[PDB]
Scaffold this active site. Structure first.
Site, PDB file in Angstrom:
ATOM      1  N   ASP B  50       0.946  -1.156  -0.120  1.00  0.00           N
ATOM      2  CA  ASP B  50      -0.069  -0.151  -0.046  1.00  0.00           C
ATOM      3  C   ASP B  50       1.095   1.134  -0.052  1.00  0.00           C
ATOM      4  O   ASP B  50       1.766   1.367   0.807  1.00  0.00           O
ATOM      5  CB  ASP B  50      -0.862  -0.145   1.315  1.00  0.00           C
ATOM      6  CG  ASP B  50      -1.766   1.216   1.162  1.00  0.00           C
ATOM      7  OD1 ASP B  50      -1.844   1.694   0.196  1.00  0.00           O
ATOM      8  OD2 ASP B  50      -2.527   1.690   2.412  1.00  0.00           O
ATOM      9  N   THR B  83      -7.119   2.259  -4.184  1.00  0.00           N
ATOM     10  CA  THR B  83      -6.035   3.546  -3.887  1.00  0.00           C
ATOM     11  C   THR B  83      -4.916   3.383  -4.621  1.00  0.00           C
ATOM     12  O   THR B  83      -4.577   4.142  -5.369  1.00  0.00           O
ATOM     13  CB  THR B  83      -5.758   3.331  -2.306  1.00  0.00           C
ATOM     14  OG1 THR B  83      -5.153   2.209  -1.800  1.00  0.00           O
ATOM     15  CG2 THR B  83      -7.107   3.569  -1.462  1.00  0.00           C
ATOM     16  N   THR B  84      -4.373   2.232  -4.580  1.00  0.00           N
ATOM     17  CA  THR B  84      -3.203   1.839  -5.228  1.00  0.00           C
ATOM     18  C   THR B  84      -3.354   2.059  -6.826  1.00  0.00           C
ATOM     19  O   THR B  84      -2.598   2.606  -7.366  1.00  0.00           O
ATOM     20  CB  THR B  84      -2.782   0.397  -5.021  1.00  0.00           C
ATOM     21  OG1 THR B  84      -3.858  -0.595  -5.589  1.00  0.00           O
ATOM     22  CG2 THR B  84      -2.578  -0.001  -3.732  1.00  0.00           C
ATOM     23  N   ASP B 381     -13.349  -6.095   1.067  1.00  0.00           N
ATOM     24  CA  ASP B 381     -13.515  -6.159  -0.286  1.00  0.00           C
ATOM     25  C   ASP B 381     -13.961  -7.212  -0.495  1.00  0.00           C
ATOM     26  O   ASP B 381     -14.095  -7.437  -1.986  1.00  0.00           O
ATOM     27  CB  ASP B 381     -11.797  -6.093  -0.586  1.00  0.00           C
ATOM     28  CG  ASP B 381     -11.305  -4.697  -0.692  1.00  0.00           C
ATOM     29  OD1 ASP B 381     -11.944  -3.810  -0.372  1.00  0.00           O
ATOM     30  OD2 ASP B 381     -10.051  -4.657  -0.422  1.00  0.00           O
TER      31      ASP B 381
END
Lengths: 509, 513, 513
Positions: B50, B83-84, B381
């Site tokens: 992350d 996000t990545t 997720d």
């Protein structure tokens, strides 16, 4: 300690230990030493040829030296000489292997060569043991027996100390056959001569001794660190400075206060009331009027000295002593001890276990030198109580093992072959530690000692006969070591050096 | 004060941060997974797949690096992950076009390109988005374990997906907002310490860990009835104001005692009325709830309207002033179960609440207290897939050719859509092909020519559905690869990413203060 | 802030990894040495234990983090392999780094490590045989176990007392000893010595002539809250504040003493008869000289200063109950020690509570005059027991001294992995990492590592003769022959921590600062 690295500790820190350790023997060890000035955080000139002292008098800046310094101390513990040995001998051990490194010989490898040889030594050691002498009531046999140890650690009078030092330990326990780690607490008193130093027993307070002797025969004490300055927990000693009238009035109450004081001790009975504390005027003259013996300004040492011999406890509080808190001595009396007037108790039939040798001179260094010497004599006495074994003085004894150890190395081979013959070299440094302390070369001596070829009477001591290196018979010389001390000496030096040989350099977080 | 700044100097510093942001995670992203280490000023390692972690932990580079963690949390909130993706996609899309186009010098024709690629995204996505059934928890389970395997976890993929399947369905808003977009407040995630997946019970409803804190309280009663204040607690919260003396030790105490004694008698007014639950939204006092627990009345205290409101409908508890005072009832059952399930001696009351707005706080169990967090993330997720597939059964096969699936269709439209915009469109046509090729560069071989063969395979055979495997770098069917990529995720990460790029395209001047 | 990128991000990692690892090769096997780490205490620690020197003082590195992580568990899991766990990865890395130095993926080179460790673990499972819990069988292991941990003569001198500790186990289930470790330390005239005593011993005792030397019928009163109080399980207050208060405080103590000794003596009177049976109160604080005498003339054996942990093993040894008072008590709570003895060696009075109803414990009296001795000779005990216990804890054991090492390397057949060189390369550094165990041992002696090692292979390249470096001489031996054998826990587990941390290297492709 050391963030430092790069193969340092082995090739480097180890010899610096030897550096620190050498000359603290090699000119300090023998029939005498050669003075080493020391100034402690207590700033005064300290002459020490004794390994243990000068070591501890220096402060270790090594991890390296830090280890084997105790190997020399534990000798003074175990023996009372061969401490300078561990300086030179263990100092003479690893610097050999410094070659083996550049010879390309490993650590764990060559240790074995050094490892097995102490046994071979300890196996050779009983051989050159030469006769033996023990009588714990002999001052004479012990005088020459205490000689070798005081010699190394004393440049002062060898024989007359041997007459004094083999006196007390023999004299304090006349019987002996049971000997205390501290059987002699010397009363160090400056003044007159080092010859005025004499042998007394029991306890001595060189401290201010007051009141008067009402029994020289009976010695009863309650040892106290309590001030008779007006410190007592029976009543409340309270000094009032708020007004001059108050000061005058408590001093009047101080007479009856000290009447609650040295009375209460001799209420349990007492002669000397051992005072580690202070005594004020109305208290002093009262106890003078009460006619109890007040030894005054007793420091903790004479307490710690006397606290053990009577079996009483120095009290910072003043109470009538319990059985535990009131000590008795054989006799308490005022005698000039080495011809200086101080109180001298008596413990001999008390069970004794404290002799007071007045250590004297016109300087402390006179009183301090023999202080270095006398304990070696106190030490070898127990070393005598342990084994009667006589092995001759240093420098004759080593050559006999080494020659065998060398031929042993010849029978050794495998890459520790010479690593054993290295151990064979650690021997000759001891007579060299005499020869260097004398100022001639051991190679000559080694030449001679393997010329004369026999091993264990043949040695040069610190001499003016050492102009030309000149061998004397150590067993015969009155220089008398023992098996143990040597067996102790070899041990720790063989112990501490091979394990500091096993060290690596220090990583640091 | 008085300040002005210029263009590419402010534009490149974006990429300067944006690139570095985009860098290591693209090796961390996907089956190829790496550790992004931080050296603390403290000297410690911090190793992440992350970026936001190492980003947040360190000096913030103002223009780009401040922007993305936001759009990360924008994205992290959207589907729960990516996000990545956003941070790498933007900086990617921000790089080659810009200077090229900014040596050609223009903000705007670049801007329209962000949408078209984002649009060329949408269609061929939803064209090649493969409908996978929610009627099958299976056809959810196949794709739900697929997005729990994103980097390091194939393990909790089994359990946490199981928990997420019907939960997402059970997850409800309180508007009857459906539940395909469902949030992690209505999906709520609280990991419960200790226990094990064998101890794991499936809580599709909420846990109220406030509910039973002690066995004195109602337990294993089918559905509660929460009596809120208003009568069963009459109103005195106060105290009688006794005198105080600094002299006595007791007078400091007796004044504080008289404050709690009235709720003590309010909780006493509760005992006789005999609720099974009293929700006290103003709360109760220490000695008072002992009285509450006398009548087997669990106290839900100092709790908000909505916690009760949701729980009330969730737990099936009425809303009343008093059992002898009747406005009648809110709900008698919203909950087909009341489970009080404890690890340690603190009772965590897990109440499975059917299609309730509730919290849907879903019981998840690690092998210990600590790995619960990943299970939760594996459960989060996992709900992402469900809520994705509940939203769109259409989603796209994956392993990265999805990222190509737009990229070459762009190449064709660069030649089709044309204009001068083709050049931004072509310059943004390039951005989408580095990421899979990086997975394949993590594989090496020829990650380049393979991608060209993929670019072939794109138009030759398949854009995404038959793709490339990320940990392999061979032509694979991203459906047969079994790696499934949520359609909405594509709608999210790209979109979110192009905008910060438009953002950092828009601002060529940053004044400080 | 500062980002380290690519091979720069790789370098200091593998640089601080292998180099510091290379610092440590003076050790690991009896041909290894001790290694000196002086901690902040100024303590001299000369150690061959790898587990030790990691955490104590280590030159600051981010890499110093994961190394402290793994070799901890290595001492935790086995107790040995810790000195081993150092030298694997660097070899593995130095060999693996080439492929990366040759421009191949830490990713793909990771995957040969993982693939190769199996067949060695397989080989470990293959090359092991059951090496029985027989002490002599464990001796050969305990002989060798401490060797990889410490010096032979130290590895040897404990091996006597070592397996005896694990011999007294009750069929205890631990890979290590807990209660078999009772550490007594005495300043000795022998640096390396240990007095092995069965069961618990108390740190200090109280000796009195009237106090019975060896008590065969010993009703154990554990004791606390001592004679200074009067029938109280709570420790009361004291006034020493004023010189007068100190005087009036300590006089009443006698009566407080008098109560308990009374309560004591009449407790003997109940259970023991008058003096008829031996009796023991264990006063875990000092014993006041009256009650020291008054319990002694009673026939009671009054014990001064047992630890609260001595208290813990105390009532289990005698199978009794502890008491925090000196006072009349139900006879059941008095523990029956088939032996209570008190042994004074020098200054320390060692209470021997023997014929322990639970011989869960034995006692090791650690000897040395010197700290570093007393320090170190204790150290070898602690790891080795944990290690050596694996020899009894696991009926399976596996050969040490290199015998197995060259075998898996020969059997690995690196081309057999044909897939890429993902495996085929990562297996190559693997057989390399395998043989560091013979290397350092063949290293530390004469010749080379290889010069002997290349024998060991070519020797065991004649297959079925399991040959390794003769531990000390750095030259061939068959370790199965003498019984020089590393624990089934040593060798099996070791590869696990090795493969993962060097992988953790390969998974870090970036370190920010």
């Amino acid at each position: 300690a050391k963030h430092f690295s790069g193969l340092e500790e082995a090739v480097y820190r180890n010899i610096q230990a030897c550096k620190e350790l050498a000359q603290t023997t090699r000119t300090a060890y023998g029939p005498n030493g050669m003075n080493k000035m020391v100034i402690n955080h207590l700033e005064k000139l300290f002459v020490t040829n004794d390994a243990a002292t000068i070591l501890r008098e220096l402060e270790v800046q090594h991890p390296a030296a830090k280890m084997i310094v105790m190997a020399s101390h534990m000798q003074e513990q175990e023996v009372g000489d061969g401490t300078n040995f561990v300086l030179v001998f263990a100092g003479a051990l690893l610097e050999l292997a410094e070659e083996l490194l550049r010879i390309g010989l490993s650590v764990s490898e060559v240790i074995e060569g050094y490892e097995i040889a102490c046994r071979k030594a300890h196996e050779i050691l009983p051989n050159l043991v030469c006769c033996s002498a023990k009588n714990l009531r002999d001052i004479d046999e012990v005088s020459s027996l205490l000689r070798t140890s005081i010699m190394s650690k004393q440049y002062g009078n060898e024989v007359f100390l041997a007459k004094l030092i083999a006196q007390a330990c023999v004299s304090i326990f006349p019987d002996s056959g049971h000997f205390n780690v501290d059987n002699i607490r010397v009363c160090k008193i400056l003044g007159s001569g080092i010859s005025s130093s004499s042998v007394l027993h029991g306890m001595v307070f060189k401290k201010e001794t007051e009141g008067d002797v009402t029994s020289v025969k009976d010695a009863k004490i309650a040892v106290y660190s309590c001030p008779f300055d007006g410190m007592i927990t029976e009543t409340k000693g309270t000094v009032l400075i708020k007004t001059a009238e108050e000061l005058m009035n408590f001093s009047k109450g101080e007479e009856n206060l000290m009447d609650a004081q040295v009375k209460a001790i001799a209420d349990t009975g007492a002669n000397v009331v051992v005072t580690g504390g202070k005594v004020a005027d109305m208290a002093l003259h009262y106890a003078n009027k009460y006619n109890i013996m007040l030894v005054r300004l007793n420091s903790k040492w004479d307490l710690r000295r006397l606290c053990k011999t009577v079996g009483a406890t120095a009290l910072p509080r003043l109470t009538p002593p319990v059985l535990e808190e009131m000590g008795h001595c054989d006799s308490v009396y005022l005698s000039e001890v080495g011809d200086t007037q101080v109180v001298v108790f008596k413990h001999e039939k008390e069970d004794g276990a404290i002799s007071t040798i007045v250590l004297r001179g016109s300087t402390d260094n006179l009183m301090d030198d023999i202080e270095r010497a006398v304990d070696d004599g106190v030490n070898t006495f127990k070393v005598l109580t342990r084994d009667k074994r006589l092995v001759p003085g240093g420098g004759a004894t080593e050559i006999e093992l080494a020659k065998q150890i060398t031929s042993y190395g010849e029978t050794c081979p495998g890459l520790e072959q010479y690593a054993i013959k290295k151990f064979a070299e650690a021997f000759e440094a001891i007579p060299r530690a005499l020869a260097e302390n004398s100022g001639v070369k051991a190679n000559e001596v080694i030449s001679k000692l393997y010329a004369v070829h026999q091993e264990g009477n043949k040695n040069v001591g610190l001499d003016i006969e050492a102009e030309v290196p000149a061998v004397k018979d150590m067993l015969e010389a009155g220089i008398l070591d023992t098996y143990l001390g040597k067996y102790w000496a070899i041990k720790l030096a063989t112990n501490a050096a091979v394990t500091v040989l096993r060290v690596d350099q220090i990583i640091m977080a | 004060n008085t300040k002005r700044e210029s263009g590419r100097k402010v534009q490149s510093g974006n990429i300067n941060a944006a690139k570095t942001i985009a860098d290591i995670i693209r090796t961390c992203l996907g089956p190829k997974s790496m550790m992004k280490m931080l050296l603390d000023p403290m000297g410690g390692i911090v190793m992440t797949n992350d970026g936001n972690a190492i980003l947040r932990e360190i000096q913030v580079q103002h223009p780009a690096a401040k922007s993305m963690i936001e759009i990360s949390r924008t994205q992290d909130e959207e589907v729960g992950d990516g996000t990545t993706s956003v941070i790498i996609l933007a900086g990617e899309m921000l790089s080659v076009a810009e200077h090229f186009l900014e040596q050609q010098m223009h903000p705007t024709v670049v801007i329209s390109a962000y949408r078209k690629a984002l649009d060329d995204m949408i269609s061929t996505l939803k064209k090649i988005s493969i409908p996978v059934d929610i009627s099958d928890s299976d056809m959810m389970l196949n794709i739900i374990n697929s997005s729990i395997t994103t980097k390091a976890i194939s393990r909790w993929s089994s359990l946490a997906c199981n928990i997420a399947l019907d939960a997402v369905k059970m997850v409800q808003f309180e508007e009857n907002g459906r539940k395909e977009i469902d949030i992690k407040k209505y999906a709520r995630v609280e990991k419960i310490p200790g226990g094990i997946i064998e101890d794991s019970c499936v809580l599709r409803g909420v846990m109220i860990n406030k509910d039973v804190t002690h066995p004195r309280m109602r337990r294993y009663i089918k559905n509660p009835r929460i009596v809120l204040l208003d009568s069963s607690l009459e109103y005195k919260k106060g105290e009688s104001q006794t005198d105080i003396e600094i002299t006595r030790e007791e007078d400091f105490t007796r004044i504080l005692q008289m404050e709690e004694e009235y709720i003590q008698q309010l909780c006493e007014d509760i005992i006789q009325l005999k609720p099974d639950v009293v929700i006290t939204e103003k709360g109760i006092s220490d000695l008072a709830q002992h009285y509450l627990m006398r009548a087997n009345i669990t106290a839900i205290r100092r709790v908000r309207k909505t916690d009760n409101n949701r729980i009330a409908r969730a737990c099936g508890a009425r809303i009343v002033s008093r059992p002898e005072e009747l406005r009648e009832d809110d709900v008698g059952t919203g909950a087909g179960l009341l489970e009080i399930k404890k690890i340690g001696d603190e009772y965590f009351t897990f109440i499975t609440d059917c299609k309730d707005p509730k919290a849907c706080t879903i019981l998840l169990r690690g092998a210990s207290k600590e790995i619960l967090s990943e299970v939760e993330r594996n459960l989060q997720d996992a709900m992402q897939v469900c809520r994705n597939v509940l939203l769109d059964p259409q989603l796209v096969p994956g392993g990265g050719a999805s990222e190509m699936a737009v990229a070459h269709a762009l190449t064709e439209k660069s030649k089709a859509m044309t204009g001068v915009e083709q050049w931004p469109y072509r310059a943004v046509a390039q951005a989408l092909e580095v990421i899979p090729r990086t997975l394949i560069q993590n594989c090496g071989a020829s990650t380049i020519r393979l991608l060209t063969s993929l670019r072939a395979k794109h138009t030759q055979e398949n854009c995404e559905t038959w793709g490339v495997n990320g940990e392999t770098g061979t032509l694979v069917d991203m459906k047969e690869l079994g790696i499934w990529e949520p359609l909405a995720v594509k709608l999210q990460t790209y979109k979110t990413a192009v905008e910060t790029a438009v953002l950092l395209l828009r601002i060529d001047d940053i004044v400080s203060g | 802030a500062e980002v380290a990128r690519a091979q720069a991000a790789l370098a200091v990692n593998i640089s601080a990894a292998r180099g510091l690892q290379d610092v440590l090769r003076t050790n690991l096997g009896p041909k290894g040495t001790m290694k000196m780490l002086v901690s902040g205490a100024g303590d001299i620690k000369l150690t061959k234990d790898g587990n030790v020197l990691l955490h104590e003082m280590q030159i600051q590195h981010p890499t110093a983090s994961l190394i402290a992580k793994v070799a901890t568990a290595q001492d935790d899991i086995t107790g040995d392999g810790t000195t081993s766990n150092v030298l694997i990865i660097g070899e593995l890395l130095k060999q693996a780094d080439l492929y990366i130095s040759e421009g191949l993926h830490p990713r793909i080179i990771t995957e040969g490590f993982e693939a190769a460790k199996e067949k060695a673990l397989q080989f470990l499972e293959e090359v092991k045989v059951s090496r029985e819990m027989d002490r002599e069988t464990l001796i050969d292991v305990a002989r060798t176990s401490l060797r990889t941990k410490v010096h032979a003569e130290l590895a040897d001198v404990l091996t006597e007392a070592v397996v005896d500790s694990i011999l007294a186990i009750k069929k205890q289930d631990e890979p290590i000893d807990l209660f078999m470790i009772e550490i007594m330390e005495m300043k000795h005239k022998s640096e390396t010595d240990t007095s092995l005593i069965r069961g618990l011993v108390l740190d200090h005792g109280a000796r009195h002539p009237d106090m019975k030397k060896r008590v065969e019928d010993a009703y154990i009163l554990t004791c606390n809250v001592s004679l200074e109080y009067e029938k109280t399980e709570v420790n009361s207050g004291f006034f020493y504040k004023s010189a007068e208060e100190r005087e009036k405080l300590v006089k009443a103590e006698r009566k407080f003493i008098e109560d308990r000794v009374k309560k004591i003596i009449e407790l003997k009177r109940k259970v023991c008869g008058d003096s008829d049976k031996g009796f023991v109160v264990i006063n875990q604080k000092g014993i006041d000289p009256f009650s020291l005498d008054a319990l002694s003339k009673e026939g009671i054996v009054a014990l001064r200063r047992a630890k609260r942990r001595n208290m813990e093993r105390l009532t289990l040894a005698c199978g009794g109950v502890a008491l925090n008072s000196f006072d009349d008590l139900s006879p059941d709570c008095l523990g029956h020690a088939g032996l209570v003895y008190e042994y004074t060696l020098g200054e320390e009075k060692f209470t021997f509570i023997e014929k322990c109803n639970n011989p869960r414990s034995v006692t090791l009296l650690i000897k040395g005059p010197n700290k570093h001795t007393l320090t170190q000779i204790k150290d070898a005990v602690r790891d080795g027991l944990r290690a050596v216990k694996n020899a009894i804890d696991d009926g399976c054991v596996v050969p040490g001294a290199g015998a197995v090492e060259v075998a898996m390397a020969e059997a690995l057949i690196k081309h057999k992995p044909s897939v890429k060189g993902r495996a085929q390369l990562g297996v190559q550094a693997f057989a390399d990492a395998l043989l560091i165990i013979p290397k350092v041992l063949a290293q530390n002696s004469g010749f080379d590592l290889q010069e002997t090692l290349v024998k060991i292979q070519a020797e065991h390249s004649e297959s079925g003769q399991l040959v390794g470096v003769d531990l000390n001489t750095g030259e061939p031996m068959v370790a199965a022959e003498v019984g020089v054998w590393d624990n089934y826990c040593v060798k099996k587990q070791l590869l696990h921590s090795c493969t993962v941390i060097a992988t953790n290297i390969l998974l870090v492709d970036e370190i920010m600062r």
